[PDB]
Amino acid sequence: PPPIADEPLTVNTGIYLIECYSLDDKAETFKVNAFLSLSWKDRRLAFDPVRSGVRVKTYEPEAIWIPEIRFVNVENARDADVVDISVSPDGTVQYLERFSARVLSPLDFRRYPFDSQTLHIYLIVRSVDTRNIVLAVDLEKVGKNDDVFLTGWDIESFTAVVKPANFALEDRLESKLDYQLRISRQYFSYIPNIILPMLFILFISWTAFWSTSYEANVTLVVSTLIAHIAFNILVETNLPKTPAMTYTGAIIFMIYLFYFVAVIEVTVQHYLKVESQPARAASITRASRIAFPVVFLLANIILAFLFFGF
């Protein structure tokens, strides 16, 4: 029994995150636990304060027409839980439900660890006989409770883009709001825990340049390579999968490449030494001692700028 008039029905909306949690990097989902606040005008149940004796009149949800607002990027039926429905005398209705749902928003991992994400929560409504359109009421959208937290993330801001998207969909108009939760990662624990030790085991690999012992060198470079793979396995949890070209993935690939050309160098130095041209051998090792750290430092700087300064 929808409200009837000469104009499209506007439904004011607001979201208020009480809790947000479980940012699943793998499934690209995150659970949320919030207030939904709908408000719209329905003159059909507008009433008299004086004859009825009360400034505001509450109703059970079965009793009156409540618009079919629905989340779009939500993986399951939401845990709907009505908290209040109250009608002002002019027929404005104010509805407030608590809800929780796991939301599906894509994450972009290219600048990880130093990435930042912008999670989305969409809301559609579909038209009936009246055209129907949603819009944001900011006093009730200021959705962050002060206690909200994503462990490992700084929660920058919770806002909504005020202009609804409206479009044809299976021969009816539909209106869609985009709420946005913006976050940036807490990278620094990674420096002690991931980047420094990989660099250490890489440096141990470079020690072989001051050795001339081919068996000491192969044992050196290849055993460090095993250590490197083992350690990569150790931190495999903090290196989420993408089809995309990640930054960290880049520097890691580059490290495998350094293990490779170090093996090539050790082999060349041993071949030259075996062919009785010790001069070229020890010149190539003595040169490598500068070359490897430097080309690394350059390749890191290029690769850093290429992802961040671009």
**Contact residues for Na ion (CB under 5 A)?**
236
d(CA 263, CA 256): 11
Packing angle of the helix pair 196-206, 247-274 (nearest 10 deg)? 10
3-state secondary structure of 283: helix
Which one of its own copies, Na ion, Cl ion, none interacts with residue 259, CB within 5 to 8 A by kind? Answer: its own copies
Which of 52, 157, 193, 283 binds its own copies (CB under 8 A)? It is 193
Which window, 3-11, 59-67, 261-269, 288-296, contacts its own copies (CB under 8 A)?
261-269
Looking at beta carbons only, is 188 or 310 nearer to its own copies? Answer: 188
Please report, as residue ranges, which positions from 214 to 233 form the binding site for Cl ion (by CB under 5 A): 214
- Cα 172 versus chain centre, distance: 33
Which of 4, 44, 52, 210 binds its own copies (CB under 8 A)? It is 210
Looking at beta carbons only, is 10 or 242 nearer to its own copies? Answer: 242
Please report, as residue ranges, which positions from 53 to 82 form the binding site for its own copies (by CB under 8 A): 56, 58, 68, 70, 72-77, 79, 81
3-state secondary structure of 154: strand
Q: Is 304 in the site for its own copies (CB under 8 A)?
A: no
Which of 157, 186, 193, 213 binds Cl ion (CB under 5 A)? It is 213
Which one of Na ion, its own copies, Cl ion, none interacts with residue 4, CB within 5 to 8 A by kind? Answer: none
Do the bridges between strand 81-87 and strand 116-126 make them parallel or antiparallel, or are there none, so unpaired?
unpaired
Do the bridges between strand 132-136 and strand 9-24 make them parallel or antiparallel, or are there none, so unpaired?
parallel
Closest residue to Na ion in the complex (CB): 236
Q: Is 200 in the site for its own copies (CB under 8 A)?
A: yes
Residue 63, token pair as written in the block: 């009793």
Looking at beta carbons only, is 162 or 264 nearer to Cl ion? Answer: 264
| Buried residues in 54-85 as b, exposed as e (16+ CB within 10 A) | eeebeeeeeebebbebebebbeeebeeeeeeb
Which one of Cl ion, its own copies, Na ion, none interacts with residue 258, CB within 5 to 8 A by kind? Answer: none
Q: Edge-to-edge, what's the strand order for the sheet holding 116-126?
A: 69-71, 116-126, 173-185, 153-168
d(CA 74, CA 54): 39
Which window, 59-67, 218-226, 285-293, 298-306, contacts its own copies (CB under 8 A)?
218-226
Q: How far is the CB of 236 from Na ion (least distance, A)?
A: 4
Beta strands in the chain (DSSP E): 9-24, 29-41, 57-58, 69-71, 81-87, 92-104, 116-126, 132-136, 153-168, 173-185
Q: Is 251 in the site for its own copies (CB under 8 A)?
A: no
Binding residues for Cl ion, rule: CB under 5 A, are 213-214
